[PDB]
Amino acid sequence: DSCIQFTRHASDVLLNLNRLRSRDILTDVVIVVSREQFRAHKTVLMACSGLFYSIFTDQLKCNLSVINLDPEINPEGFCILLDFMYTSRLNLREGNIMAVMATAMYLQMEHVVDTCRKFIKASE
Amino acid sequence: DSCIQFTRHASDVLLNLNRLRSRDILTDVVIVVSREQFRAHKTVLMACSGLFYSIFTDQLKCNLSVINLDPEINPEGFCILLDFMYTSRLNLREGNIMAVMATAMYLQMEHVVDTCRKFIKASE
Amino acid sequence: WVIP
Amino acid sequence: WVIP
Ligand SMILES: O=C1Cc2cc(Nc3nc(Cl)ncc3Br)ccc2N1
Ligand SMILES: O=C1Cc2cc(Nc3nc(Cl)ncc3Br)ccc2N1
Ligand SMILES: [Cl-]
Ligand SMILES: [Cl-]
């Protein structure tokens, strides 16, 4: 086509979606990770995770307001990944890398799994 | 912080939200523009438009499944802007620039209004 | 704005 | 991935 493109548009959209998340505006699901609860937008979760994409396209699960993750999932690892979904920034540290990689594999977040594998390979 | 950032994340999120829109997945509102209807995600509309942000943060309008725009709004101009919201690409043409600018002013989409004003000033 |  |  003959379209023009606004370079910062996608980043500005995500920044605003994160602002809605911070103020709990139009969040439509609670993700339960053991004793912790995380409110989010189903659409953002699907856009970032192969697991959430599969969950919310299911004709029965699409209508659930609460989703319980596998008990092996670490709430801190999930929190780090939820923040990454809404910001593009990943708080990857020596102390959390194993939990973050395990959580990203479960959530099916391929680019996160890739950087974790590379950071782990560098330290061996 | 000491975060790392994935450059393409925001663009990939928006591409996936547009894929959900194309398949009519988890759309939660119909925007009525005269005889035309446009299905969308309230969160994406709020993230792109000062008017939709104001509408869906209202305690009564947040619950509406149908929103009727002012009858002066052109359905083609709205369609072009809805596509821009989900893609960052704006189909700005000599034949549609006036309708697109009028629609972007109504929707409170400041960057679109700015490029329309500049393209109009160049042709005078 | 750019030419994509 | 980059250092932002
Ligand atoms: O690593 C990742 C990230 C991700 C996101 C989605 N999400 C969607 N995929 C498609 Cl094709 N359409 C709409 C949506 Br929402 C699917 C798989 C994966 N795997
Ligand atoms: O030209 C524009 C585009 C735009 C978008 C929003 N959307 C939001 N703004 C804020 Cl501050 N927080 C969350 C959201 Br969603 C507000 C105003 C405007 N004006
Ligand atoms: Cl990812
Ligand atoms: Cl804009």
Side-chain angles (χ1 to χ4, degrees), chain A residues 37-58 60-82:
Chain A
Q37 291 190 0
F38 300 91
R39 296 208 49 96
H41 299 96
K42 286 174 185 178
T43 57
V44 176
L45 299 179
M46 296 165 82
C48 299
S49 156
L51 185 70
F52 289 125
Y53 173 63
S54 291
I55 295 168
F56 301 121
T57 55
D58 174 83
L60 282 176
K61 300 184 191 70
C62 66
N63 293 138
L64 296 175
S65 60
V66 178
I67 301 296
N68 304 303
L69 302 194
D70 187 292
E72 207 84 65
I73 304 303
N74 178 254
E76 190 192 30
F78 184 76
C79 188
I80 288 162
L81 291 175
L82 185 61

Tab-separated table of all heavy atoms in Angstrom, chain A residues 37-82, unseen atoms left out:
chain	number	residue	atom	x	y	z
A	37	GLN	N	-2.273	-13.591	43.477
A	37	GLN	CA	-3.253	-13.250	42.453
A	37	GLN	C	-2.750	-12.093	41.611
A	37	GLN	O	-2.203	-11.139	42.167
A	37	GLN	CB	-4.588	-12.887	43.126
A	37	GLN	CG	-5.291	-14.065	43.796
A	37	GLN	CD	-6.700	-13.764	44.257
A	37	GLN	OE1	-7.236	-12.658	44.095
A	37	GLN	NE2	-7.334	-14.762	44.849
A	38	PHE	N	-2.928	-12.175	40.273
A	38	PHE	CA	-2.476	-11.144	39.331
A	38	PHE	C	-3.610	-10.800	38.392
A	38	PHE	O	-4.096	-11.681	37.680
A	38	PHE	CB	-1.279	-11.651	38.508
A	38	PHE	CG	-0.089	-12.032	39.355
A	38	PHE	CD1	0.064	-13.333	39.826
A	38	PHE	CD2	0.901	-11.098	39.649
A	38	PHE	CE1	1.154	-13.681	40.626
A	38	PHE	CE2	1.997	-11.450	40.445
A	38	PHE	CZ	2.118	-12.740	40.926
A	39	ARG	N	-4.059	-9.546	38.416
A	39	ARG	CA	-5.128	-9.097	37.523
A	39	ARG	C	-4.511	-8.689	36.173
A	39	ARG	O	-3.423	-8.087	36.123
A	39	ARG	CB	-5.929	-7.936	38.152
A	39	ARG	CG	-6.692	-8.356	39.440
A	39	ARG	CD	-7.948	-7.518	39.666
A	39	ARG	NE	-8.756	-7.454	38.441
A	39	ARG	CZ	-9.795	-8.235	38.162
A	39	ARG	NH1	-10.247	-9.096	39.061
A	39	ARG	NH2	-10.424	-8.121	37.001
A	40	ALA	N	-5.198	-8.999	35.065
A	40	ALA	CA	-4.655	-8.655	33.737
A	40	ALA	C	-5.759	-8.570	32.703
A	40	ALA	O	-6.935	-8.817	33.023
A	40	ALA	CB	-3.605	-9.689	33.300
A	41	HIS	N	-5.376	-8.201	31.472
A	41	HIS	CA	-6.279	-8.168	30.329
A	41	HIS	C	-6.043	-9.465	29.539
A	41	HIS	O	-4.900	-9.740	29.133
A	41	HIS	CB	-5.966	-6.956	29.429
A	41	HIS	CG	-6.127	-5.652	30.152
A	41	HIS	ND1	-5.036	-5.003	30.723
A	41	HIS	CD2	-7.264	-4.984	30.489
A	41	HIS	CE1	-5.534	-3.931	31.332
A	41	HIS	NE2	-6.872	-3.886	31.234
A	42	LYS	N	-7.098	-10.252	29.323
A	42	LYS	CA	-7.000	-11.503	28.535
A	42	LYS	C	-6.301	-11.247	27.184
A	42	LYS	O	-5.429	-12.023	26.796
A	42	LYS	CB	-8.404	-12.093	28.264
A	42	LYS	CG	-9.014	-12.737	29.500
A	42	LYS	CD	-10.445	-13.156	29.204
A	42	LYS	CE	-11.088	-13.682	30.455
A	42	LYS	NZ	-12.498	-14.055	30.200
A	43	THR	N	-6.672	-10.170	26.468
A	43	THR	CA	-6.083	-9.903	25.147
A	43	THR	C	-4.577	-9.727	25.199
A	43	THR	O	-3.887	-10.264	24.336
A	43	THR	CB	-6.774	-8.741	24.448
A	43	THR	OG1	-6.685	-7.607	25.301
A	43	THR	CG2	-8.227	-9.087	24.071
A	44	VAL	N	-4.060	-9.011	26.215
A	44	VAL	CA	-2.608	-8.809	26.345
A	44	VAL	C	-1.921	-10.142	26.647
A	44	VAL	O	-0.886	-10.448	26.036
A	44	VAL	CB	-2.270	-7.728	27.395
A	44	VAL	CG1	-0.742	-7.623	27.585
A	44	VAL	CG2	-2.850	-6.374	26.944
A	45	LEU	N	-2.508	-10.943	27.564
A	45	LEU	CA	-1.941	-12.254	27.882
A	45	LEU	C	-1.856	-13.145	26.629
A	45	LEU	O	-0.803	-13.749	26.374
A	45	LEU	CB	-2.766	-12.958	28.972
A	45	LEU	CG	-2.879	-12.270	30.356
A	45	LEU	CD1	-3.773	-13.126	31.305
A	45	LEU	CD2	-1.483	-12.043	30.974
A	46	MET	N	-2.923	-13.156	25.804
A	46	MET	CA	-2.946	-13.963	24.570
A	46	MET	C	-1.911	-13.478	23.572
A	46	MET	O	-1.242	-14.287	22.928
A	46	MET	CB	-4.325	-13.896	23.916
A	46	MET	CG	-5.411	-14.498	24.778
A	46	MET	SD	-7.004	-13.977	24.116
A	46	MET	CE	-7.158	-15.136	22.844
A	47	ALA	N	-1.756	-12.146	23.458
A	47	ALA	CA	-0.805	-11.540	22.525
A	47	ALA	C	0.664	-11.872	22.867
A	47	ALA	O	1.520	-11.801	21.982
A	47	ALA	CB	-1.009	-10.014	22.496
A	48	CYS	N	0.947	-12.199	24.153
A	48	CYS	CA	2.309	-12.465	24.643
A	48	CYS	C	2.673	-13.920	24.890
A	48	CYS	O	3.864	-14.188	25.071
A	48	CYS	CB	2.532	-11.676	25.926
A	48	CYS	SG	2.409	-9.887	25.725
A	49	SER	N	1.675	-14.804	25.079
A	49	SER	CA	1.911	-16.163	25.565
A	49	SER	C	1.134	-17.181	24.754
A	49	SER	O	-0.097	-17.068	24.642
A	49	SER	CB	1.468	-16.211	27.030
A	49	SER	OG	1.119	-17.493	27.533
A	50	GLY	N	1.839	-18.204	24.253
A	50	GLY	CA	1.187	-19.294	23.534
A	50	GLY	C	0.217	-20.053	24.426
A	50	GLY	O	-0.851	-20.487	23.962
A	51	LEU	N	0.548	-20.171	25.742
A	51	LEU	CA	-0.377	-20.850	26.675
A	51	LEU	C	-1.695	-20.058	26.856
A	51	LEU	O	-2.781	-20.630	26.716
A	51	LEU	CB	0.308	-21.087	28.043
A	51	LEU	CG	-0.545	-21.901	29.048
A	51	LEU	CD1	-0.676	-23.384	28.623
A	51	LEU	CD2	0.025	-21.795	30.433
A	52	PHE	N	-1.607	-18.743	27.118
A	52	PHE	CA	-2.834	-17.939	27.277
A	52	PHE	C	-3.617	-17.848	25.980
A	52	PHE	O	-4.842	-17.860	26.014
A	52	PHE	CB	-2.542	-16.560	27.877
A	52	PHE	CG	-2.167	-16.659	29.342
A	52	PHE	CD1	-0.978	-16.108	29.811
A	52	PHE	CD2	-3.019	-17.281	30.260
A	52	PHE	CE1	-0.634	-16.198	31.172
A	52	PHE	CE2	-2.645	-17.419	31.611
A	52	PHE	CZ	-1.463	-16.862	32.056
A	53	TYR	N	-2.920	-17.826	24.830
A	53	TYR	CA	-3.607	-17.807	23.526
A	53	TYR	C	-4.496	-19.072	23.417
A	53	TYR	O	-5.669	-18.970	23.047
A	53	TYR	CB	-2.557	-17.773	22.406
A	53	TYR	CG	-3.149	-17.921	21.029
A	53	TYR	CD1	-4.031	-16.972	20.522
A	53	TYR	CD2	-2.856	-19.030	20.241
A	53	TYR	CE1	-4.584	-17.107	19.245
A	53	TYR	CE2	-3.397	-19.174	18.969
A	53	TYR	CZ	-4.248	-18.204	18.471
A	53	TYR	OH	-4.760	-18.364	17.216
A	54	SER	N	-3.935	-20.246	23.750
A	54	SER	CA	-4.661	-21.518	23.713
A	54	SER	C	-5.826	-21.540	24.719
A	54	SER	O	-6.920	-21.976	24.365
A	54	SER	CB	-3.704	-22.682	23.959
A	54	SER	OG	-2.811	-22.839	22.868
A	55	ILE	N	-5.595	-21.044	25.952
A	55	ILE	CA	-6.617	-20.983	27.018
A	55	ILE	C	-7.812	-20.115	26.615
A	55	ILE	O	-8.952	-20.571	26.705
A	55	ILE	CB	-6.019	-20.488	28.390
A	55	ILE	CG1	-4.991	-21.494	28.970
A	55	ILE	CG2	-7.144	-20.195	29.423
A	55	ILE	CD1	-4.154	-20.909	30.163
A	56	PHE	N	-7.559	-18.867	26.199
A	56	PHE	CA	-8.673	-17.970	25.960
A	56	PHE	C	-9.324	-18.120	24.587
A	56	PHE	O	-10.338	-17.459	24.345
A	56	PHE	CB	-8.280	-16.518	26.277
A	56	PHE	CG	-7.846	-16.376	27.724
A	56	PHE	CD1	-6.577	-15.904	28.044
A	56	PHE	CD2	-8.721	-16.683	28.766
A	56	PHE	CE1	-6.176	-15.770	29.381
A	56	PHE	CE2	-8.309	-16.575	30.104
A	56	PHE	CZ	-7.044	-16.104	30.401
A	57	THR	N	-8.814	-19.019	23.721
A	57	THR	CA	-9.503	-19.328	22.458
A	57	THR	C	-10.341	-20.587	22.648
A	57	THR	O	-11.106	-20.964	21.752
A	57	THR	CB	-8.574	-19.424	21.243
A	57	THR	OG1	-7.538	-20.367	21.502
A	57	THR	CG2	-8.019	-18.065	20.805
A	58	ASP	N	-10.226	-21.229	23.831
A	58	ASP	CA	-11.053	-22.401	24.128
A	58	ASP	C	-12.463	-21.905	24.427
A	58	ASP	O	-12.621	-21.006	25.247
A	58	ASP	CB	-10.485	-23.198	25.312
A	58	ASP	CG	-11.404	-24.328	25.719
A	58	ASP	OD1	-11.334	-25.396	25.091
A	58	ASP	OD2	-12.236	-24.118	26.625
A	59	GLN	N	-13.487	-22.527	23.799
A	59	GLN	CA	-14.899	-22.139	23.915
A	59	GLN	C	-15.445	-22.132	25.352
A	59	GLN	O	-16.390	-21.385	25.615
A	59	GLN	CB	-15.789	-22.981	22.987
A	59	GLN	CG	-15.627	-22.609	21.514
A	60	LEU	N	-14.877	-22.944	26.273
A	60	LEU	CA	-15.286	-22.925	27.679
A	60	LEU	C	-14.399	-22.008	28.522
A	60	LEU	O	-14.914	-21.268	29.358
A	60	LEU	CB	-15.248	-24.341	28.306
A	60	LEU	CG	-16.385	-25.293	27.995
A	60	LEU	CD1	-16.118	-26.650	28.624
A	60	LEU	CD2	-17.730	-24.763	28.493
A	61	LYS	N	-13.063	-22.094	28.362
A	61	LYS	CA	-12.146	-21.334	29.214
A	61	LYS	C	-12.150	-19.839	28.909
A	61	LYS	O	-11.847	-19.053	29.806
A	61	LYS	CB	-10.716	-21.911	29.196
A	61	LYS	CG	-10.619	-23.371	29.676
A	61	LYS	CD	-9.144	-23.790	29.715
A	61	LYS	CE	-8.956	-25.282	29.916
A	61	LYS	NZ	-9.350	-26.089	28.736
A	62	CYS	N	-12.541	-19.444	27.673
A	62	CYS	CA	-12.626	-18.024	27.276
A	62	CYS	C	-13.514	-17.208	28.227
A	62	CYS	O	-13.320	-15.994	28.340
A	62	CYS	CB	-13.085	-17.877	25.827
A	62	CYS	SG	-14.795	-18.419	25.515
A	63	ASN	N	-14.500	-17.876	28.884
A	63	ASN	CA	-15.475	-17.256	29.780
A	63	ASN	C	-15.099	-17.276	31.261
A	63	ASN	O	-15.850	-16.755	32.096
A	63	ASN	CB	-16.868	-17.879	29.556
A	63	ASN	CG	-17.415	-17.538	28.179
A	63	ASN	OD1	-17.988	-18.380	27.490
A	63	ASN	ND2	-17.201	-16.307	27.718
A	64	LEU	N	-13.956	-17.884	31.599
A	64	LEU	CA	-13.532	-17.951	32.993
A	64	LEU	C	-12.931	-16.622	33.434
A	64	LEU	O	-12.194	-15.995	32.657
A	64	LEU	CB	-12.512	-19.092	33.209
A	64	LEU	CG	-13.021	-20.525	32.958
A	64	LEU	CD1	-11.887	-21.525	33.085
A	64	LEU	CD2	-14.170	-20.896	33.904
A	65	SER	N	-13.235	-16.196	34.672
A	65	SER	CA	-12.692	-14.952	35.234
A	65	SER	C	-11.461	-15.242	36.112
A	65	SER	O	-10.763	-14.316	36.522
A	65	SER	CB	-13.761	-14.207	36.029
A	65	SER	OG	-14.254	-14.995	37.099
A	66	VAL	N	-11.222	-16.536	36.419
A	66	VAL	CA	-10.089	-17.000	37.234
A	66	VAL	C	-9.401	-18.164	36.516
A	66	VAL	O	-10.072	-19.126	36.104
A	66	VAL	CB	-10.513	-17.413	38.682
A	66	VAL	CG1	-9.318	-17.930	39.493
A	66	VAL	CG2	-11.216	-16.266	39.421
A	67	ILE	N	-8.064	-18.079	36.399
A	67	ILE	CA	-7.225	-19.127	35.818
A	67	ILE	C	-6.163	-19.508	36.844
A	67	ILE	O	-5.379	-18.654	37.263
A	67	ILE	CB	-6.611	-18.744	34.436
A	67	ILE	CG1	-7.718	-18.401	33.366
A	67	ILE	CG2	-5.607	-19.805	33.924
A	67	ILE	CD1	-8.694	-19.552	32.940
A	68	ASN	N	-6.098	-20.801	37.194
A	68	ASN	CA	-5.136	-21.328	38.149
A	68	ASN	C	-3.974	-21.970	37.424
A	68	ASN	O	-4.171	-22.928	36.672
A	68	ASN	CB	-5.793	-22.371	39.081
A	68	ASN	CG	-6.996	-21.883	39.823
A	68	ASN	OD1	-6.947	-20.897	40.550
A	68	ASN	ND2	-8.100	-22.588	39.678
A	69	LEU	N	-2.766	-21.453	37.647
A	69	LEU	CA	-1.585	-22.029	37.023
A	69	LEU	C	-1.095	-23.257	37.801
A	69	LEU	O	-1.467	-23.462	38.967
A	69	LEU	CB	-0.449	-20.994	36.891
A	69	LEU	CG	-0.734	-19.700	36.087
A	69	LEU	CD1	0.577	-18.981	35.771
A	69	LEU	CD2	-1.543	-19.967	34.802
A	70	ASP	N	-0.262	-24.067	37.149
A	70	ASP	CA	0.343	-25.271	37.724
A	70	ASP	C	1.031	-24.896	39.060
A	70	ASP	O	1.710	-23.866	39.106
A	70	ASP	CB	1.367	-25.834	36.727
A	70	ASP	CG	1.970	-27.176	37.111
A	70	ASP	OD1	2.736	-27.225	38.097
A	70	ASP	OD2	1.703	-28.166	36.408
A	71	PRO	N	0.856	-25.691	40.137
A	71	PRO	CA	1.483	-25.330	41.435
A	71	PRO	C	3.003	-25.208	41.429
A	71	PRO	O	3.553	-24.592	42.343
A	71	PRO	CB	1.008	-26.428	42.401
A	71	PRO	CG	0.517	-27.535	41.542
A	71	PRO	CD	0.055	-26.933	40.248
A	72	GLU	N	3.685	-25.750	40.407
A	72	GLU	CA	5.149	-25.658	40.298
A	72	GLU	C	5.572	-24.230	39.894
A	72	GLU	O	6.742	-23.872	40.035
A	72	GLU	CB	5.668	-26.660	39.247
A	72	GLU	CG	7.096	-27.131	39.464
A	72	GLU	CD	7.238	-28.290	40.434
A	72	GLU	OE1	6.728	-29.392	40.123
A	72	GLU	OE2	7.864	-28.099	41.502
A	73	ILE	N	4.638	-23.429	39.368
A	73	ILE	CA	4.984	-22.079	38.911
A	73	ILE	C	5.256	-21.140	40.066
A	73	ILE	O	4.454	-21.023	40.992
A	73	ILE	CB	3.922	-21.526	37.923
A	73	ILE	CG1	3.739	-22.496	36.723
A	73	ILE	CG2	4.274	-20.100	37.453
A	73	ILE	CD1	5.041	-22.840	35.889
A	74	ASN	N	6.378	-20.450	39.966
A	74	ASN	CA	6.856	-19.491	40.950
A	74	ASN	C	6.146	-18.138	40.769
A	74	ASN	O	6.197	-17.588	39.668
A	74	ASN	CB	8.383	-19.342	40.809
A	74	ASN	CG	8.970	-18.326	41.746
A	74	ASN	OD1	9.338	-17.233	41.330
A	74	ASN	ND2	9.062	-18.663	43.032
A	75	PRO	N	5.494	-17.575	41.822
A	75	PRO	CA	4.806	-16.274	41.660
A	75	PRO	C	5.718	-15.112	41.239
A	75	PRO	O	5.283	-14.264	40.450
A	75	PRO	CB	4.171	-16.033	43.035
A	75	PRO	CG	4.115	-17.389	43.686
A	75	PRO	CD	5.325	-18.105	43.192
A	76	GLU	N	6.983	-15.087	41.724
A	76	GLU	CA	7.921	-14.025	41.343
A	76	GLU	C	8.261	-14.114	39.835
A	76	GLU	O	8.237	-13.094	39.153
A	76	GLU	CB	9.191	-14.031	42.214
A	76	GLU	CG	10.024	-12.781	41.956
A	76	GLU	CD	11.436	-12.731	42.516
A	76	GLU	OE1	12.077	-13.798	42.653
A	76	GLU	OE2	11.909	-11.607	42.796
A	77	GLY	N	8.552	-15.326	39.343
A	77	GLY	CA	8.815	-15.557	37.924
A	77	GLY	C	7.631	-15.105	37.081
A	77	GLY	O	7.805	-14.441	36.047
A	78	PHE	N	6.404	-15.440	37.537
A	78	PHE	CA	5.202	-14.998	36.813
A	78	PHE	C	5.118	-13.455	36.822
A	78	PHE	O	4.867	-12.848	35.781
A	78	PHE	CB	3.911	-15.623	37.416
A	78	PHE	CG	2.712	-15.233	36.581
A	78	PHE	CD1	2.474	-15.845	35.350
A	78	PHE	CD2	1.928	-14.136	36.931
A	78	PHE	CE1	1.424	-15.425	34.529
A	78	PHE	CE2	0.874	-13.718	36.112
A	78	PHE	CZ	0.645	-14.345	34.903
A	79	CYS	N	5.309	-12.834	37.988
A	79	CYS	CA	5.271	-11.373	38.117
A	79	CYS	C	6.237	-10.666	37.134
A	79	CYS	O	5.850	-9.697	36.458
A	79	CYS	CB	5.546	-10.961	39.558
A	79	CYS	SG	5.299	-9.191	39.861
A	80	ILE	N	7.479	-11.192	37.036
A	80	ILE	CA	8.527	-10.665	36.153
A	80	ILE	C	8.051	-10.766	34.701
A	80	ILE	O	8.209	-9.817	33.924
A	80	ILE	CB	9.869	-11.401	36.407
A	80	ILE	CG1	10.477	-10.956	37.784
A	80	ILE	CG2	10.871	-11.191	35.242
A	80	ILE	CD1	11.514	-11.899	38.329
A	81	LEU	N	7.476	-11.913	34.349
A	81	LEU	CA	6.972	-12.113	32.979
A	81	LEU	C	5.752	-11.268	32.667
A	81	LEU	O	5.647	-10.761	31.543
A	81	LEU	CB	6.751	-13.593	32.697
A	81	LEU	CG	8.074	-14.400	32.618
A	81	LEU	CD1	7.761	-15.845	32.474
A	81	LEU	CD2	8.967	-13.943	31.439
A	82	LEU	N	4.828	-11.083	33.643
A	82	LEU	CA	3.658	-10.214	33.448
A	82	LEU	C	4.119	-8.764	33.197
A	82	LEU	O	3.653	-8.096	32.259
A	82	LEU	CB	2.717	-10.328	34.664
A	82	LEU	CG	1.384	-9.556	34.528
A	82	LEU	CD1	0.549	-10.074	33.332
A	82	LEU	CD2	0.568	-9.637	35.838
